[PDB]
Design a protein around this ligand. Structure first.
Ligand SMILES: [Mg+2]
Ligand SMILES: [Mg+2]
Ligand SMILES: [Mg+2]
Ligand SMILES: [Mg+2]
Ligand SMILES: [Mg+2]
Ligand SMILES: [Zn+2]
Lengths: 50, 197, 55, 101
RNA sequence: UUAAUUGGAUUCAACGCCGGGAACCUCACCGGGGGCGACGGCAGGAUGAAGGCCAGGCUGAAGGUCUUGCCGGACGCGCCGAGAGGAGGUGCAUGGCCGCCGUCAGCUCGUACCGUGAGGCGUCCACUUAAGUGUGGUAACGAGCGAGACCCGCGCCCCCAGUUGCC
RNA sequence: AUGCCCCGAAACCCCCGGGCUACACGCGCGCUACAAUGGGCGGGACAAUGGGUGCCGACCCCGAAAGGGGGAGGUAAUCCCCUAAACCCGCCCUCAGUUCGGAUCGCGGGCUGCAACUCGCCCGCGUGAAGCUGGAAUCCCUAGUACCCGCGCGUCAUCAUCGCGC
C-alpha cells in the first residue's frame, strides 16, 4: 500500500503549500495538479487551472 | 368511487393478519379486529399466551407498532392483547396445536385422539381431523378420524362449521393437518320440533 | 460505482411494471377496482375479503 | 332548513336498517319532517376467474361477487336533532356522509 | 432448418390450453459486459486498508478498467470454513389446489346371529322413483355421511317508501 | 410453501442487441366466401348487461379520412361511453368467374411508445389469386332452446377472427 502524502511544497522557516483550498467545501482540502485543469478531485471543477 | 374505498380497506386487514400469523406462530395467534375511530385506530389480538406476545415487560409491542405503522397503513395504532373466546371451538387453533405437537416428536395417533377427546369434551357436536404426509414410509398416505354429526355439502356446511389448515415441517418433509368442528348449536333444517301445549 | 450494477430500472408499463402484493410474480394480475393480486392468490383469500359465491 | 342529506352505504343489509330506524325515530321524537329511506340501486362487483393452477383438464370457472347496499335520507336542520344524530355511533362496516343544500 | 429457434400437456380427460393477444421487461433461450460471501478465523492495516470523481483512451456505451491525482477515515474473498440466492434436477420423496369415473348412487358403523376361516347378513325379493327415494315380506333391529332439505336469480299480487328516478 | 442431491464468485444479481413471429410439409379449432333465400347507392325504425380520477369526454372550431387544437360536467339512478346490426321503402345490376370473392403487392398521410427494419395498429388511390355446394367419414342441439345479427367487460401505453356475459 506504500506511502504517498508529500510534496506539499514546504521548507523550514516558512511554508507556502502548493495547491490551494477548495472553494466548494470548507478550506483545507486541496485540488489537483493534472496540468490542464484543477479538477478538484471530488467535487467537480474545471477552471483550467490557474 | 365507493367500491374502491370498500375493497381498499378490506385488503389491509388481510395483509396484517397474514403477517401476524407467521410472527405469532407460537402463542397461537387467534385473530384480530380493527376499530377505526377519529384521530387513530385501535388493534386487538386474541393471543393464547399474553406473556409471549407482550414481550419482556413491553419490549416487543413497541416493535409491533413501529412495524405495523411503517410498512402498513394505520397511521395511529394502539395494540392490546386479550384471551381467546373459546379455544376448543376454533378450528384454526387446534390445527396449529396438533401441528406443533407433531413437529415436537409425538406419534401422529396420540395427538389426534388427545385432540378429539378434548374437543368433544368441551362440548362440540362433531369433529373431523385428517392428516396426510410422508408418515411411516416413503410413499405418502392419509388417515381420518371423526366423532359424530358433521355436515359436508350444501349451504349449512359452509357457515356453521369451522375449518382450518396448517403445516408441520419435519426432518423428512411437510405434513398437512385439516380440522373441522361443529359449534354446539347446529340447528339444521331437519330439526323441526313441536312447541306443545 | 458498485451500486450501479445490481440496481434495476423504473418501468411504468408492460408485464414487468406490476407484481402481486403477496406472492411476487409477474403475469396474470387482477386490476379490477384496484386490488393487485395473482389469479391464484385471489382464489384462496377471497372469502376473507368479503366476497361470496352465489352462482 | 337547508335540508341536510345523509348517505349510508354498507355491505351487510341488516346492520343498515338499524341505523336507518335510529335516524327515523330521532327525527320523530323531536319536531321535524323527513323523507324515508329511499333505496338506491345496489352496486354488485363481479370477478370471473379460472380455477386450476396448471392448464390441464377441462376449463371450469368461478363467479365471486360482492354487493353494496345504499340508501338516502332527506331531513331538515334543527340543532336539537342536528346534534341528536351525532351520538348515533355507526357500526364499523357502514359509511356515513352528511351535507346540506 | 438455426448461434438460439426455452419448456409442460398426446384418445375420451393434449392442441384460441399454462388466463401464453411475448417490440424492451415478461424470460426460463443463444452473443457480449459488469456486480454479490451476515459470521468465525488467515497474510495486511491510522507511515494510512475498505471504499468514491472533473478530463482522456479501450469499449456497442460506460471512472467498468488504465492514464491522471484528488478524496475519504477503519477495517480486511488476496486465503479457509460457512451463508445468501436459484423459473437448476426430481410431480415416482411430500403439502395445497384442480380434471375424470360422476351431480353417478353409492360408502360405512353399534349390538345380535351364520361360517374353523377370508367373509356374510342388514345393503336381499316384489312393485314404484331423478335417486340405497318409498310401500309391503323377511336373522335382523337401529343409525351416519352422500341424495332431498339449504342458498341465489326469474315470472304474478299487496303494504312501506319518492331523489339524482317517472310525468 | 417444501425434504434430499448438484451451482456458490457460479446454474446467483443487473444492463445493451438478437430469438420465442424461422418454412418442401401432416393435423386440431375458427373467420370470410363460392352470389338473387343477393351486391351497391340515398332515406326510415326499435336494446340490455356493464365501465370511468394514471380516467370517461358532452359542446365549439380546423381536416376528404385516420386524426389534431380548445374544453364545460363528472369520486356516479345526476355528467360521459351510447341515436346498435340483422329489418323496411326507392333507384341501378340480371345469372356472369360477374357491379360475386377481396387474398397478394406499389406509393402517400397519421396514433401509442424511451425505441416500430427484423416484428405494432389505423387511413386514401391503384393491381384483382384460389374459389361455381364439397369423397369415405364425423360434431352440436328438446323451447324463448338451435340457427342468423350486433354490443359490453377482461388482457391493455397502443393491437381481439379469443375467453366470459348481454
Ligand atoms: Mg425478450
Ligand atoms: Mg362409482
Ligand atoms: Mg409461441
Ligand atoms: Mg364487391
Ligand atoms: Mg415494424
Ligand atoms: Zn399472488
Amino acid at each position: 500500500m506504500g506511502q504517498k502524502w508529500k510534496l506539499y511544497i514546504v521548507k523550514d522557516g516558512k511554508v507556502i503549500r502548493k495547491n490551494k483550498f477548495c472553494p466548494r467545501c470548507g478550506p483545507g482540502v486541496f485540488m489537483a495538479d493534472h496540468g490542464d485543469r484543477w479538477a478538484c478531485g471530488r467535487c467537480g471543477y474545471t477552471e483550467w487551472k490557474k | 368511487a365507493i367500491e374502491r374505498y370498500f375493497i381498499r380497506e378490506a385488503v389491509k386487514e388481510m395483509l396484517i393478519d397474514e403477517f401476524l400469523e407467521k410472527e405469532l406462530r407460537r402463542a397461537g395467534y387467534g385473530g384480530l379486529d380493527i376499530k377505526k375511530t377519529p384521530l387513530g385506530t385501535k388493534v386487538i389480538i386474541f393471543a393464547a399466551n399474553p406473556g409471549y406476545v407482550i414481550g419482556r415487560g413491553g419490549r416487543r409491542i413497541r416493535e409491533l407498532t413501529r412495524i405495523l405503522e411503517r410498512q402498513f397503513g394505520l397511521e395511529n395504532p394502539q395494540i392490546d392483547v386479550q384471551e381467546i373466546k373459546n379455544p376448543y371451538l376454533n378450528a384454526k387453533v387446534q390445527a396449529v396445536r396438533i401441528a406443533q405437537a407433531l413437529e415436537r416428536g409425538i406419534h401422529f395417533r396420540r395427538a389426534a385422539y388427545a385432540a378429539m377427546r378434548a374437543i368433544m369434551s368441551n362440548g362440540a357436536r362433531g369433529v373431523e381431523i385428517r392428516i396426510s404426509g410422508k408418515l411411516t414410509g416413503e410413499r405418502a398416505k392419509s388417515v381420518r378420524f371423526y366423532q359424530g354429526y358433521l355436515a359436508k355439502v350444501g349451504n349449512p356446511a359452509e357457515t356453521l362449521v369451522s375449518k382450518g389448515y396448517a403445516q408441520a415441517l419435519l426432518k423428512l418433509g411437510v405434513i398437512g393437518v385439516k380440522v373441522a368442528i361443529m359449534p354446539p348449536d347446529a340447528r339444521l333444517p331437519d330439526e323441526i320440533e313441536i312447541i306443545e301445549k | 460505482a458498485k451500486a450501479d450494477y445490481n440496481k434495476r430500472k423504473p418501468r411504468k408499463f408492460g408485464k414487468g411494471a406490476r407484481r402481486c402484493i403477496r406472492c411476487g410474480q409477474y403475469g396474470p394480475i387482477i386490476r379490477i377496482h384496484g386490488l393487485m393480486l395473482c389469479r391464484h392468490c385471489f382464489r384462496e383469500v377471497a372469502p376473507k375479503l368479503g366476497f361470496r359465491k352465489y352462482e | 332548513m337547508q335540508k341536510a342529506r345523509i348517505k349510508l352505504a354498507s355491505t351487510n343489509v341488516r346492520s343498515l336498517e338499524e341505523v336507518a330506524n335510529q335516524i327515523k325515530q330521532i327525527a320523530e321524537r323531536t319536531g321535524v319532517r323527513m323523507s324515508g329511506p329511499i333505496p338506491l340501486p345496489t352496486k354488485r362487483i363481479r370477478i370471473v376467474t379460472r380455477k386450476s393452477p396448471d392448464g390441464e383438464g377441462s376449463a371450469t370457472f368461478d363467479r365471486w361477487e360482492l354487493r353494496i347496499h345504499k340508501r338516502l335520507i332527506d331531513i331538515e336542520a334543527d340543532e336539537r336533532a342536528m346534534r341528536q344524530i351525532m351520538r348515533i355511533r355507526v357500526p364499523e362496516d357502514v359509511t356515513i356522509e352528511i351535507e346540506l343544500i
